[PDB]
Structures are given as structure tokens and as C-alpha cells.
Amino acid sequence: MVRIYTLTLAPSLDSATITPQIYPEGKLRCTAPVFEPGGGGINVARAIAHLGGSATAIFPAGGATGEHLVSLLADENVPVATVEAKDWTRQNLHVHVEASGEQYRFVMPGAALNEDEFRQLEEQVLEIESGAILVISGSLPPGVKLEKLTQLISAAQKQGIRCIVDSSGEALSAALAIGNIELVKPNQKELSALVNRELTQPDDVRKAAQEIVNSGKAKRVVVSLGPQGALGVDSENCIQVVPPPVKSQSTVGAGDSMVGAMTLKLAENASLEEMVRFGVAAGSAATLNQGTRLCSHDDTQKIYAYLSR
Amino acid sequence: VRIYTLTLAPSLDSATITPQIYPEGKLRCTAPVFEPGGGGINVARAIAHLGGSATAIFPAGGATGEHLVSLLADENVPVATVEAKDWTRQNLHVHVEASGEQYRFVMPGAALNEDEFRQLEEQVLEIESGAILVISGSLPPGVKLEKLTQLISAAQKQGIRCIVDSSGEALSAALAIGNIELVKPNQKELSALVNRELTQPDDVRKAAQEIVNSGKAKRVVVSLGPQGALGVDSENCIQVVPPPVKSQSTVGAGDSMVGAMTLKLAENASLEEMVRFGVAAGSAATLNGTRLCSHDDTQKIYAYLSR
Amino acid sequence: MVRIYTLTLAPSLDSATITPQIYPEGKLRCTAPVFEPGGGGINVARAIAHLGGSATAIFPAGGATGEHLVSLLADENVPVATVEAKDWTRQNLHVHVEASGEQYRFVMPGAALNEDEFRQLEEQVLEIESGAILVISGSLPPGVKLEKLTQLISAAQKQGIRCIVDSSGEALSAALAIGNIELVKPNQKELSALVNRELTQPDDVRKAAQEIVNSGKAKRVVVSLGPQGALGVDSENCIQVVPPPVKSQSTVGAGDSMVGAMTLKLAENASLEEMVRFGVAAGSAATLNQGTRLCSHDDTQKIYAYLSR
Amino acid sequence: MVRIYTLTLAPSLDSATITPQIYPEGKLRCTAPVFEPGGGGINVARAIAHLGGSATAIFPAGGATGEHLVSLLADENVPVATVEAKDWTRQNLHVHVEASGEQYRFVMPGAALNEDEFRQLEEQVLEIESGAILVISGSLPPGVKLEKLTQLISAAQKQGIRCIVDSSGEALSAALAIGNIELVKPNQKELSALVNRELTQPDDVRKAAQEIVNSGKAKRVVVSLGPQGALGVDSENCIQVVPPPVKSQSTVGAGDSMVGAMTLKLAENASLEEMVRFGVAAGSAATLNQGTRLCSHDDTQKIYAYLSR
Ligand SMILES: Nc1ncnc2c1ncn2[C@@H]1O[C@H](COP(=O)(O)OP(=O)(O)OP(=O)(O)O)[C@@H](O)[C@H]1O
Ligand SMILES: Nc1ncnc2c1ncn2[C@@H]1O[C@H](COP(=O)(O)OP(=O)(O)OP(=O)(O)O)[C@@H](O)[C@H]1O
Ligand SMILES: Nc1ncnc2c1ncn2[C@@H]1O[C@H](COP(=O)(O)OP(=O)(O)OP(=O)(O)O)[C@@H](O)[C@H]1O
Ligand SMILES: Nc1ncnc2c1ncn2[C@@H]1O[C@H](COP(=O)(O)OP(=O)(O)OP(=O)(O)O)[C@@H](O)[C@H]1O
Ligand SMILES: Nc1ncnc2c1ncn2[C@@H]1O[C@H](COP(=O)(O)OP(=O)(O)O)[C@@H](O)[C@H]1O
Ligand SMILES: Nc1ncnc2c1ncn2[C@@H]1O[C@H](COP(=O)(O)OP(=O)(O)O)[C@@H](O)[C@H]1O
Ligand SMILES: O=P(O)(O)OC[C@H]1O[C@](O)(COP(=O)(O)O)[C@@H](O)[C@@H]1O
Ligand SMILES: O=P(O)(O)OC[C@H]1O[C@](O)(COP(=O)(O)O)[C@@H](O)[C@@H]1O
Ligand SMILES: O=P(O)(O)OC[C@H]1O[C@](O)(CO)[C@@H](O)[C@@H]1O
Ligand SMILES: O=P(O)(O)OC[C@H]1O[C@](O)(CO)[C@@H](O)[C@@H]1O
Ligand SMILES: [Mg+2]
Ligand SMILES: [Mg+2]
Ligand SMILES: [Mg+2]
Ligand SMILES: [Mg+2]
């Protein structure tokens, strides 16, 4: 198995709290917050750790919030490679409402990155050995030119680094502008915006995913479909995997759990079939847990065994 | 064989649109659009749309009742109506533009006298041996559960093949009678039926099969919404999953699935064919208020799933 | 006192139901609907009868829903003068959610009126004696052009019918364009649209209201200010009245109750001060009741006595 | 003019953000948060500084959030007297929703205060000279017994310090029990619990406020009435002041700004009528903007002049 790295240009220090009910204007009394690491690439790294793997997380850490994010990851035994940033690491809030059992997720933008901090992140990335995997996951923070992300990807590929991409909107289209991306996981909306057309016909999602592969932007496209599982295509095969009929408790963490699992499989030279199935197992395993908990090893394995009969 | 359906609690469905939803203020709504509604009625509508013929049996009361009959007449749906004193209920479906979501305000079904129920019970027993009867929708005020189950038992004794898609208690009671041709519980209904949480990947299959192996029903199709359906009989097991297409209104989606599945059951099709056609029609019925599944959309989704 | 009449071009059969929860997509099981009369002019007439006066409600009624509306008014002993119409009277839905105590008001468009049916309504209005009061209140049904509403008001004023107007938007604006209205009650939002400018400075509401008076558009302008009561102006005087510090249960009906009370006082040749105080008394009394219930006599009198000390 | 101090046992670093709509489950995209000092007595001191007076804020401060609080207060030229606490200053999140215009307020528990940290706060308070004014405002931190805050008030009064209390529930009751409070500003619910009965009649709020004054518990009672302004009484006079009809936005710190303006007038030995007017002006000025910006000098002055006509 090759070494695995993740990149998070917009990291997060997530906080979670509980309150009896939700209504405007009044003071909603919340419990003492519980802190957790957050961010696309970061959670991929955490998910991979839960599955018995190892992934080093590269990200900017700013201020006291940045320190805490670093500290929590250290407790979680997740290796980290950081860059001191000036703009303090953002802090998001997750609210559980007792009366309804519903959750509310307020997501602030990532802290800004200057040219300096972005340069150092690129230097960290280009220290990765040839043949290793790099997962770039999450939103693009302010202060980062769309051209810079593209140049970083082009540079990594240039020295034999294998790139996996999970983003949205403009940054996603930028990452695929280069091409030769080993794997991307768009959801249905993300795929829709990418090819800039509504996917109304039954075979539209597959045709859109195949077009991406056929044009050489990505070797593998796994379109994640929420409760419907996923549809994966490369230059030869197509696989569709549906989760087991078990009720979802909380969809939070599903997308990153699926990316982490599929990353591990790519690392072990897995077939497309095993990659997607293990991807759906982890993503669905994450939804069995309340709140923000990512996939656990046992739930994932249990679902994977079921899908792989 | 011939198909009939039975709706004890019909509804004149009304659909409207509003910009957004919030309390206290006046929420301006558009001019409502009226459509036929109610479980067995929608089933019969679906079957007509799919090229088959099913006679819908139900009570109609007042001007809402006439409105409902007039709409079904325009859809060439054979009706066997019983005149009732209490007016046919009127349900309101509000589509919110800022969310794309739908809110469903569902009034109680119209009351049913002993005499009116008697007339319906006489219509049902005028069904010949070999035909199929689809009992669908909730139980209206004035109707004893035991009166429904005696109706099933009586129907059974004269060769009427019964399909039941109703309330929680009606589902349980119909299964106690046993030999039900087809039931379509969703996940919550299956769980409430067998009195346990379905937590393992295979729990839904195990509970559905358990129902078939115990003789309570011949076929169990567990409806999964977005994930399609999982069907079992005494021999085979199949899950069919819908295409990745966004849903609008899902009202009557279960009913369309039941209609399509009944249709294939009436053609003596295979379990795999029945479930596939079921999910095809069920999802086609989510592409628009209470319009249900069209012939073209169902055929297209079907041809897709059947690849 | 003189005779009092109201005009509701868009009447309503209001149905009220109760449901335990509110959420999308599900079947929200609702109780069998209770019915009551709806429409602006109709509610003005109902509030007047509660306050000891007597007002005849003029409106179209169509089909079984129309008859249902007429029957409900008779059960409350409010006199009516109806015109039969082909298009059935609309039906609105009021939903009270038990889990939260919130209420939701789904308002359908008014029923259509053809030429002959509107010509009958106009005939009814023009049979009102000179010196008598007519309150025009509520929205405009489709099919009725503003030019027709203004021609109706103009004709009425020609034979000395004293017109009071409560509307919004183009309807209110066109009515004031005719001029010589005895009284208008815009709320803050409705005043702003009239003058076509944001009212942001402390004295803006008073200035805008006075403008309407000085221009001749209306002899009296009472701007209702929700919990803050009201500010009324005529050619000579300005008065502001705040409701007493008692909690409101439900503010629906407050508008029509106020207009009801101020109409009664105008009919009794009351001073501006008495009229505004009574209007706030009735409007605020309505808020003491749950749901859609209008002002009661005893509550109004209690508040009015307090204000008039 | 005597010196003014405030005491905030449970300070807050307020954060304010903006999101288009509010719904469960999904990631809600929010704008970058804006930070400002929060907590009852802290907002009182800030409002005073905005209005051209000077008040010294006494409070505990902990961690990086405590440092952020202090720094933000220097920017606003509010003099402070802080005690270092081990538990970090809390951080509350206020979320404004665009499509509704409403605000959601998630309020974390106040930071812990041990015996030694509270002792430091008390020693800082008892350094205040005789004749000076102390404002005690805001919730009680978990781990602080009422008897401690109560003993602090009595000790304070023994050495001539003039105490003003703005609290709720047991704290306000306990404070009033000691008696001789210069001023209290309960809202309507707060007042009802003090006198332990429902305020259902028009004159109930006034009677209730007068009973407290007459008993000698407080020398002045000002019942704040939200949009309806405030009703103030002392041993001789009584006045209700209603604000101008201006659009209100965020209400956070409205009560504190009111308490601040009234504390100034009490220090200038002003009359009841000036005091209540200035308070309504400040409180209403504090509602024109989003977040916790409080009242500005020019807005308060322009409103105050209007009210004094
Ligand atoms: N409601 C659900 N029920 C069962 N499995 C689910 C559900 N939602 C998501 N999953 C599983 O998790 C995987 C990923 O979810 P999804 O398609 O929503 O990705 P995503 O939109 O990128 O997630 P995220 O918003 O966290 O980034 C799905 O393919 C599926 O396997
Ligand atoms: N977009 C919205 N989201 C949430 N609440 C709203 C919204 N618009 C209005 N409201 C609510 O409406 C109530 C009062 O204002 P509103 O204009 O709705 O009352 P109204 O009497 O029905 O209006 P009007 O009298 O002008 O017809 C308030 O509770 C306010 O919160
Ligand atoms: N929250 C309240 N508390 C006390 N009194 C109120 C309240 N809201 C309204 N009122 C009383 O009702 C009167 C009219 O209400 P409002 O200013 O909202 O008019 P309106 O918006 O046209 O009413 P409506 O929306 O019902 O048509 C007010 O002047 C006041 O007397
Ligand atoms: N305009 C809206 N009104 C109400 N709910 C909405 C709206 N938009 C999104 N939602 C909610 O979002 C949920 C779906 O997931 P959604 O895509 O919105 O979040 P997400 O998974 O964080 O997005 P993404 O994965 O693309 O980052 C729906 O269940 C729905 O409740
Ligand atoms: N959100 C959806 N997306 C796609 N297909 C759907 C959706 N909801 C329902 N369907 C189709 O309709 C069928 C019945 O829907 P379901 O919600 O299970 O019925 P019920 O009303 O009994 O819960 C499903 O099996 C599926 O084929
Ligand atoms: N909606 C509003 N409109 C105008 N002024 C307001 C509004 N809400 C508050 N204020 C001003 O702020 C002061 C205090 O507000 P209030 O809600 O009574 O405080 P509290 O938060 O203690 O309940 C009020 O007396 C008033 O001057
Ligand atoms: O039969 P119920 O449970 O009383 O509800 C009646 C409603 O259900 C329908 O029959 C069908 O909708 P569903 O597919 O959600 O069950 C509507 O047409 C009708 O308004
Ligand atoms: O002191 P509490 O009751 O814990 O509340 C603290 C919050 O209240 C504020 O002091 C504002 O006061 P109000 O909402 O009572 O006007 C905020 O600054 C702070 O976030
Ligand atoms: O990187 P984005 O898209 O801004 O999302 C950040 C949020 O998403 C998460 O990674 C979970 O989806 C959280 O850790 C974090 O709060
Ligand atoms: O806003 P519209 O179209 O005039 O409808 C009137 C509605 O408002 C009410 O007057 C409530 O004040 C009801 O009588 C009626 O349901
Ligand atoms: Mg994702
Ligand atoms: Mg169903
Ligand atoms: Mg009004
Ligand atoms: Mg307060």
C-alpha cells in the first residue's frame, strides 16, 4: 500500500452543542460545546484512520482555533503536516435540537490564505514521494486564485503523485481542467453544475460521468447518490451500488467517509467494483451514527461483507 | 382477470403553490387545482394510465363528490359509486417555492353510515371469482375494523384475490386472515408489523420473507422510497432501484406502484417483472401534485431498469 | 348615527383545522374543519355587531360554499345583502399546530366576478341612502379592473355616500387617487408603498400620513402600528395611541376589528381622539383572543375605558 | 458626576453571521463572522461609551476569547478592570436569516468561576468609592451561588456604592430582597415572576411596578416593553414612553443600551421623565442594526429629541 496524504485548504474547528428547541429572537440556551476536527481532506484522513488505515493531513492552522484543531488531531492519532497561517482557523457550529431531534449546521468560510501560506502548502505537497496518493477535499478559502490550485495539482502529477479530488463549483471545474485525476466523487448536484446541464433522464448521470472519463479529465468518476448509493465508471466498466435498506440516522460525514474508504482501496490496487462497494459501505455506515460521527470499522465491514456476497 | 379497487375514504385532492411558508402571516396561494384522490382511487387511475382497466368502488357525497366523479369520468375510470350523506373530504397540498417542498393537510375521510357501508359491501361481493380486489387508503369514521376483515374473509370465500394497502391496524388484521395476494408495507410499516427495529442490512428481507413463509401473504413488496422496492415471494427475491432523478410530489407514488404491480399480477407476470414495473411506475409518479404515473414515463423508466 | 354598510368584493369561507405537527412531505393528519365567515368587509361588519352597532355586509356568494358563508353570518345575526355569482366562493384554510402553538393561514384568490354580477353589486351600493357610511375592505378578485372599483367609489360619493377604505397595493392607491375618502387605515407597510418611499426617520410616518390629508386624498388617515397602536391625523390634529401592556395571543383580526370600531365612532360623529382610541381598543382586544376571533365588546370597553381615563 | 462601573459575571464574545435560509440537515453557508464584546454589564458600559459618558467594565476573562473581548473593548474606548479566569470566555453565535429577516441566538453557558476568581471580582468591586454607581447585569455563571452575589451587593451598599440590577429569576428576586436598589429594569415576563401573578389587566404592569417601589425594594422600576417602549415609576411620578415607528432589526443589547442611557441620566441627577425617554431612545437606537452594535450617539440623540417634543 502506498502512502496517503490529504489536503485541506479550508480547514475547520467544528463545535457541537445541544439545545431544547429552536425559534428566532429568543436566547436559545445551549450546552457546553464539544470540539472536533473538520474539513474535507481532514475528515477523509480521520475516516481512513477509523478503517485501520493511515493518512497524513496537510492544512493551514491559524491562531488559537488552529492550535486546538491540531491538538484534537494529535489525540486522534492522525498524522499532520501544517503551515502557520495568519488568519485564524474558522469555527463552525453544529446544533442538536432536542424537541425535534433535528440538527442545524452553520458553516463559515475557510480562513483566508495569503500567497505565502499557499506557497508553503504547495511545498509540503511537493515533498510527497512519487507513487503516493493525495486527496484534495473541501471548499476553497478566500485569497486563493483558481489558477493556483490548478498549478499545484499539475505540479504534483508532474512528479508522480496520484491525485483524488472532492470539491464543488468553480474549484472542482478547475481541478479537472488539468486532467489525469485518478478519481473524483461529485454528488448529483456537483455533477450537474460541472457539466452545466440538468440531469432529468434516467441515463443522464451515467452519460455525464462517462463524458468526464472519455475526455481524460479523470480516470474514475464515482457519482455519489445519497440514499441511492453510487454509480462508478472508468474507461471500460460501470458499477452501481445501493446501500442496505436500513434507516439513516444522520447523513453528516457520509461524503468524506466514502472518499476515505475509496482512497484506501485505490491505495491497495482494488478493482472498480470493490472500490465503489467499500465506498458505499463507509458512507452508509456513517449515517447509522447520530450527529457528526464518521464511519466506524465494524459497521463499514459489516455493510461491505453484505454488498460483496 | 378483472381488477377492482376499494377506497373507503376517498378525497378530492387540491393542489396550490405559495412563495414561502411561515406562521402568523397570510400565505398567498395560487388558484387550486383539483384532482381525484384516495388510495384505491389512485390505484385505479394508475392502472388506467398504464393501459389497463380497473373499476374503482367508493362512496361519494355532496358537490365535492360530484366533482370527484366528474374528474374520474374525464379520465375514463370505471366507477362504482355509493351516494353518501357526509360530503367527500377535501385535502390541501401546498407547494412551497423557496424550498421545493410540499406540505400535506389531510382531513378525516367522510363519515360512513351502516347503510352506506352495506351498499359498498354488496358491490364488493358482486365481484366474480378469480378477479382481483385492491383495498387501499385509510379507514373513515363509522367503519369498524372487524367489518373490513369480515369483508376480506367473505371475498376470499368466493374466490376474490385480495390486495391490501391500508392503515397499520388494517394491515395486521388482513394478514391474520391470511392468503393476502400482495401487501406493500414501507420500512416503518414493516417494523411496526413485526414489532422490532430493522437495524441489520438483511433485516428487511428477513421480515418480508417471514411474512410469506407464514402464509399470511403470497407476495411482500417492501417499499423503500428513494431506494425503490424489495420484493419477495415463496421462491425469489429482488430489489429494484430507481434512476437518479429528482422527485417532486410523491403523493400516490405508492398507489401507482400498487396499480402497476396489480396490473402485472393480473397478467400473471414474474416477481422480477412485477417489482421492476412497480418501481418504474412509482418513480414516474414522482415526476410532477396528484398526477400519478403516465404511460410514457413509466415505459421509459421501465425500459431503463429492464436493461 | 347613520346606517352602516360594508363591501367585500372577495368574500371567503374560512375553514380552521388542528394538526399536532408540521413538516413537509408527510401526511399531516388534521381534524374536521370548523367554519366561519371571511373577507375584510365581512369581518368589519362582524366586529361592528360585537361592539353594539349594526352593519349590513354586501358581497357576492356563489355555490354551496357561498350558501355556507351566508348561513354562518345569519347564525351570528349579521345582516347581509348578497348577489348570486356563478363562480363558487373561495375557501381559505387556517391551521393550528399543537406542538408549537403556531398558526398558518393559507389564503386563496377571491372568486371571479362577471359583468352582470358586478353590475348587481354596484346597484346594491347605489341603493344606500345619502349620509350613510360604506366600508370597502379586502382584496380584489380577478376580473375586476381598478377602473371599475374607482368608478364605483366615485358614483357612491356623488350621492353623498361616505366612503371608508381598507386595502393594499394598486387598489388602495387608486382609491386615494379619487380623493375625498372619509378614512383610510394603512399599516406601516401599506403607507410606505402608497407614498412610494422608505419611512426611516422618527417623524416620517406622521409626515406621509399628513401628506395624504393635505393633498385631499382622504380627510382622515389612521396609520396602524401593530403593538405600537396607531397615529391618526386630520386637517387640524394629530393623535397617537398606544395599547396597554397586556400580552397578545393572536394578532389576526386586529386590522378588521380596528376599522370596525373606527367606523362605529365615525357614525356617532366622534372626535378624532375618540375614534383612534376606540380603534386601538378594538384592534388590541382582538389580539387577546386565540386564533381568528375578533374583538369582543367587554374587552374593547375595558381597554377603551383605560385609554379614556 | 459620580463614576460609573458595571459588573458582568458571565461575559461573552459575541459572533454574528448571515445565511440565506434556515433548514435542518444540510450545510448552511454562512458569511465570515463579525466579533464584538457581549454580556450584560459589558454592553451597558459600551452603550455608555457610545453616548459620550464613561463607565468601567469589571469582568472575568479567560483564554483567547477573553483576550479578544478585552482587545475589542479597547477599540471602543471602554475602560476595563479584568480578572484572569481559568475557564475560557464563552462565545455565542447570532445568525441572521436573509429570507425571513429573523435572527437565531445560540447561547453557550457562562464560563466557570472558582472561589478565588470570584474573590478577585469582589475585591475589585469593593474598591469602588462611596457615592459611585455600580450596574450588575447579565446571567449568573454556573458554579456561582446566589448568596455570594447577594453578599456582594449588601457589602457594596454598606460602603455607599449605589447599585443598579438588571437580571432575571432568582437573582433579581434575591437582589430586590436586599432592597434599596437604585434601579431595576425587568421586562414584562420578569416583572410577572417578581410579583408572582399574571398581569392580565391594562393597569397591572403599572401597579406591579409601583408595589415594588413602595415596598422600598427599588427606588425606581422601569418595565421595558419591547416595541411599546417602557413604563417607569418612582415614589412620585409615572410615565410610559413609546418609540417612533422605525424598523427594528437585531434586539441584542437593546435592554443593556437602555440601562446604560438611564444610568447616565441617573448620574446627571436627571428627572424620571428624561431618564425613561433617554432609555427608550437608546434601546430603540440599539435595534436599528444587526449584531451587537448597540446604540450610536447620533441615532440616540435624534430619537431622544423627537420623543422630547
Ligand atoms: N440517506 C442515506 N441512506 C443511506 N445511505 C446514505 C444516505 N445518504 C448518504 N448515504 C451514503 O453515503 C454516501 C455519500 O453520501 P452523499 O451522496 O450524500 O455524498 P455527499 O453529498 O458528498 O456528502 P456530504 O454532503 O457529507 O459531503 C452515499 O453514496 C451513500 O452510500
Ligand atoms: N418571509 C417571512 N418569514 C418569516 N416570518 C414572516 C415573513 N414575512 C412576514 N412574516 C411574519 O408576519 C408577521 C407579521 O407581519 P405580516 O406582514 O406577515 O403580518 P400581516 O398582517 O399578515 O401582513 P399584512 O397585514 O401587511 O397583510 C410577523 O410575525 C412576521 O414575522
Ligand atoms: N402585537 C400587538 N399587541 C397589541 N396590540 C396589537 C398588536 N398587533 C396589533 N394590535 C392592535 O391592532 C391594531 C391593528 O393592527 P395592525 O397595525 O397590524 O393592522 P393590520 O396590519 O392592517 O392588521 P391585519 O394584519 O389583521 O389586517 C393595532 O393598531 C393595535 O391596536
Ligand atoms: N431551500 C431549502 N429549503 C429547505 N430545505 C433545504 C433547502 N435546500 C436544501 N435543503 C435541505 O438540504 C437537505 C439535502 O442536503 P443538502 O444538499 O441540502 O445539503 P448538503 O448535503 O450539505 O449539500 P452538499 O452535499 O451538496 O454540500 C434536504 O434534506 C433539505 O432539507
Ligand atoms: N423520492 C423518491 N425518488 C424516487 N422514487 C420514489 C421516491 N419516492 C417514492 N418513489 C417510488 O414510489 C415507490 C413508493 O414510495 P414509498 O414512499 O415507499 O411509498 P409509501 O407512500 O408507501 O411510503 C417507491 O418504491 C419508488 O419506486
Ligand atoms: N421591536 C422593537 N421596536 C422598537 N424598540 C424596541 C424593540 N425592541 C426593543 N426595543 C427597545 O429596547 C428596549 C428594551 O427592549 P426589551 O425587549 O424590553 O428588553 P429585554 O431584552 O430586557 O426584554 C425597549 O424598551 C425599546 O426601547
Ligand atoms: O388514505 P389516507 O391515508 O387517509 O390519505 C389520503 C391521501 O393519500 C392519497 O390517497 C395518496 O397519497 P399517498 O401515496 O402518500 O398515500 C392522497 O390522494 C390522499 O389525499
Ligand atoms: O447574560 P446571558 O443571559 O447569558 O446572555 C448573554 C447574551 O446577552 C447579551 O448580553 C445581550 O443581551 P440581551 O439579548 O438580553 O439584550 C449578549 O451580548 C450576550 O451574548
Ligand atoms: O469545506 P467546506 O465545504 O466549507 O465544509 C466544511 C464543513 O464540512 C465538514 O467537513 C463536514 O461535511 C465539516 O468538518 C466542516 O464543518
Ligand atoms: O387577503 P384577502 O384576499 O382579502 O383574504 C381575506 C382573509 O383575511 C381575513 O380578513 C383575516 O383578517 C379573513 O377574513 C380572510 O380569510
Ligand atoms: Mg461531499
Ligand atoms: Mg403508503
Ligand atoms: Mg390590515
Ligand atoms: Mg434582559
What is the rounded distance in angstroms from the CA atom of residue C156 to the CA atom of residue C160?
A: 7
The whole-angstrom distance between D282's CA and the closest CA on chain B is: 29
Cross-strand pairs, D81: D58
**How is B184-244 classified by DSSP, letter by letter?**
--BHHHHHHHHTS---STTHHHHHHHHHHHTTSEEEEEEE-GGG-EEEE-SS-EEEE---S
Grid cell at residue B168:
397499520
DSSP structure class, residue C20:
S
3-class SS of residue D16: strand
What is the rounded distance in angstroms from the CA atom of residue A16 to the CA atom of residue A93?
A: 6
Catalytic option among C87, C234, C256, C299: C256
**How many residues comprise chain B?**
307
What is the rounded distance in angstroms from the CA atom of residue A257 to the CA atom of residue D27?
A: 16
What is the rounded distance in angstroms from the CA atom of residue B238 to the CA atom of residue C244?
A: 69
Instruction: Estimate to the nearest angstrom the gap between the alpha carbon of D160 and the chain centroid.
Output: 22
The ligand that comes nearest to the alpha carbon of residue A257 is 1
Grid cell at residue D236:
412620585
**Nearest CA owner, ligand 7 atom 8:** B38
Q: Name the residue among B61, B150, B165, B66 with its Cα closest to residue B113.
A: B61
What is the rounded distance in angstroms from the CA atom of residue A255 to the CA atom of residue A249?
A: 15
| Residue pair B5/B18 in contact by the 8 Å Cβ criterion | no
Pocket of ligand 5 (CB under 6 A): B 186, 223-226, 228-229, 242, 247, 250, 253-254, 257, 279, 282-283, 286
Technique that determined the structure: X-ray
Tell me, using a 6 A CB cutoff, whether residue A8 lines ligand 9: no
Residue of B nearest to D24 (CA): B99
Alpha helices in D229-308 (DSSP H): 254-267, 272-285, 297-307
Tell me, using a 6 A CB cutoff, whether residue C255 lines ligand 3: yes
What is the rounded distance in angstroms from the CA atom of residue D151 to the CA atom of residue B196?
A: 58
Q: Which residues in chain B are closer than 8 Å to D23, comparing Cβ atoms?
A: 99
In the structure, how many helices (H) and strands (E) does chain A have? 10, 14
3-class SS of residue A239: strand
Inter-chain Cβ pairs, chain B and chain D, closer than 8 A: 6
Query: What number does CATH give the domain B1-307?
Result: 3.40.1190.20
What is the rounded distance in angstroms from the CA atom of residue A49 to the CA atom of residue C118?
A: 76
**How many residues comprise chain C?**
309
What is the rounded distance in angstroms from the CA atom of residue B248 to the CA atom of residue B100?
A: 8
Strand D91-97, strand D103-107: pairing: antiparallel
Residue A263 CB neighbours (<10 A): 31
Tell me, using a 6 A CB cutoff, whether residue B7 lines ligand 7: no
Backbone phi, psi, residue D304, to 5°: -60, -40
**How is B267-282 classified by DSSP, letter by letter?**
TT--HHHHHHHHHHHH
What is the rounded distance in angstroms from the CA atom of residue B34 to the CA atom of residue D57?
A: 65
**Residue numbers preceding breaks in chain A (C to N > 2.5 A):** none
Resolution (Å) of this entry: 2.1
What is the rounded distance in angstroms from the CA atom of residue A3 to the CA atom of residue A126?
A: 14
3-class SS of residue C221: strand
In the structure, how many helices (H) and strands (E) does chain D have? 10, 14
Q: Residue C116: which residues within 8 A CB-CB, separation 6 or more? A: none
DSSP structure class, residue C187:
B
D204 catalytically annotated: no
**Distance from the CA of A100 to the center of ligand 12, in angstroms?**
23
Residue D148 CB neighbours (<10 A): 17
Instruction: Estimate to the nearest angstrom the gap between the alpha carbon of A65 and the chain centroid.
Output: 21
| Residue pair D262/D183 in contact by the 8 Å Cβ criterion | yes
Cross-strand pairs, C42: none
| Residue pair D272/D237 in contact by the 8 Å Cβ criterion | yes
**How is A85-148 classified by DSSP, letter by letter?**
ESSPPPEEEEEEETTT--EEEEEPPPPP--HHHHHHHHHHHTTSPTT-EEEEESPPPTT--HHH
D46 by Cβ neighbours in 10 Å (0-12 / 13-18 / 19+) ranks as: buried
- Give all chains having 3 or more CB-to-CB distances under 8 Å with chain C: B, D
**Maximum distance among all Cα pairs of chain D, rounded to whole angstroms:** 57
| Residue pair D110/D141 in contact by the 8 Å Cβ criterion | yes
Residue among B223, B279, B288 to mutate when testing ligand 5 (max atoms within 8 A of CB):
B223
The answer to whether residue A202 neighbours chain D at the CB level (below 8 Å) is no
Q: Which residues in chain D are closer than 8 Å to A90, comparing Cβ atoms?
A: 32
CB-based contact B198 A245, cutoff 8 Å: yes
The whole-angstrom distance between B102's CA and the closest CA on chain C is: 5
DSSP structure class, residue C239:
E
**Nearest CA owner, ligand 3 atom 1:** C227
> C175-180 long-range CB contacts below 8 Å, 24 or more apart?
C175/C136, C175/C149, C175/C150, C176/C212, C176/C217, C176/C218, C177/C150, C177/C217, C178/C150, C178/C153, C178/C154, C179/C215, C179/C216, C179/C217, C179/C218, C180/C216, C180/C218, C180/C219
What is the rounded distance in angstroms from the CA atom of residue C285 to the CA atom of residue C15?
A: 23
**How is chain B classified by DSSP, letter by letter?**
--EEEE-SS-EEEEEEEES---SSSEEE-PPPEEEEESHHHHHHHHHHHTT--EEEEEEE-HHHHHHHHHHHHHTT--EEEEE-SSPPPEEEEEEETTT--EEEEEPPPPP--HHHHHHHHHHHTTSPTT-EEEEESPPPTT--HHHHHHHHHHHHHTT-EEEEE--HHHHHHHHHH--EEEE--BHHHHHHHHTS---STTHHHHHHHHHHHTTSEEEEEEE-GGG-EEEE-SS-EEEE---S------TTHHHHHHHHHHHHHHTT--HHHHHHHHHHHHHHTT--------HHHHHHHHHHHT-
Alpha helices in C185-271 (DSSP H): 188-195, 204-214, 254-267
CB-based contact B244 A188, cutoff 8 Å: yes
Match 415614589 to its residue by C-alpha cell: D235
DSSP structure class, residue C227:
G
**Distance from the CA of D237 to the center of ligand 14, in angstroms?**
24
**Nearest CA owner, ligand 9 atom 14:** A38
Cross-strand pairs, C240: C231
Superfamily classification of domain A1-309:
Ribokinase (3.40.1190.20)
Residue C140 CB neighbours (<10 A): 21
**Nearest CA owner, ligand 2 atom 3:** D100
Grid cell at residue B12:
378530492
**Distance from the CA of C274 to the center of ligand 10, in angstroms?**
27
What is the rounded distance in angstroms from the CA atom of residue A12 to the CA atom of residue A306?
A: 34
Q: Report how far apart, in Å, the C-alpha atoms of B44 and of each of B24, B25, B40, B285, C169 are.
A: 39, 39, 6, 14, 46
DSSP structure class, residue C110:
P
Grid cell at residue A65:
482555533
Half-sphere exposure of B135 (CA within 13 A, CB side): 29
3-class SS of residue D155: helix
**Distance from the CA of D24 to the center of ligand 4, in angstroms?**
8
3-class SS of residue A306: helix
Q: Report how far apart, in Å, the C-alpha atoms of C268 and of each of A141, B305, C57, C292 are.
A: 69, 77, 19, 27
Match 391500508 to its residue by C-alpha cell: B166
